[PDB]
Amino acid sequence: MDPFLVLLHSVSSSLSSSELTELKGLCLGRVGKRKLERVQSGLDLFSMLLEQNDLEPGHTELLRELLASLRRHDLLRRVDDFE
């Protein structure tokens, strides 16, 4: 139960189909289309990146970057706020 994960459980509810929509399109040319086939909610994409890509306690600049593209400072604020 990493710390960045316990925080992703709260911000994940604010994402909704809105965040999943933006981060999904940009994910095609960034994370991986095959990985999106399994992605379903917010904790899904966050579980894959943390697995082995670019996401960990003290290194979530990639995820927070995509949220910055959606222009969502209410959620993106909590992400970079954890540190």
From Swiss-Prot:
Q: What is the effect of changing E51R?
A: Loss of interaction with CASP8
Q: Which residues of the full protein are shown?
A: 1 to 83 of 208
What would be the name of the gene that encodes this protein? FADD
- Disease implication from the record: Infections, recurrent, associated with encephalopathy, hepatic dysfunction and cardiovascular malformations: A condition with biological features of autoimmune lymphoproliferative syndrome such as high-circulating CD4(-)CD8(-)TCR-alpha-beta(+) T-cell counts, and elevated IL10 and FASL levels. Affected individuals suffer from recurrent, stereotypical episodes of fever, encephalopathy, and mild liver dysfunction sometimes accompanied by generalized seizures.
What does the UniProt record report as the effect of altering K33E in this chain? Loss of self-association
What biological function has been recorded for the protein in this entry?
Apoptotic adapter molecule that recruits caspases CASP8 or CASP10 to the activated FAS/CD95 or TNFRSF1A/TNFR-1 receptors. The resulting aggregate called the death-inducing signaling complex (DISC) performs CASP8 proteolytic activation. Active CASP8 initiates the subsequent cascade of caspases mediating apoptosis. Involved in interferon-mediated antiviral immune response, playing a role in the positive regulation of interferon signaling.
| Tissues where this protein is expressed | Expressed in a wide variety of tissues, except for peripheral blood mononuclear leukocytes.
Locate the DED domain: which residues? 3-81
Instruction: List where in the cell it is found.
Output: Cytoplasm
Q: What is this protein called?
A: FAS-associated death domain protein
Subunit (UniProt): Can self-associate. Component of the AIM2 PANoptosome complex, a multiprotein complex that drives inflammatory cell death (PANoptosis). Component of the death-induced signaling complex (DISC) composed of cell surface receptor FAS/CD95 or TNFRSF1A, adapter protein FADD and the CASP8 protease; recruitment of CASP8 to the complex is required for processing of CASP8 into the p18 and p10 subunits. Interacts (via death domain) with FAS (via death domain).
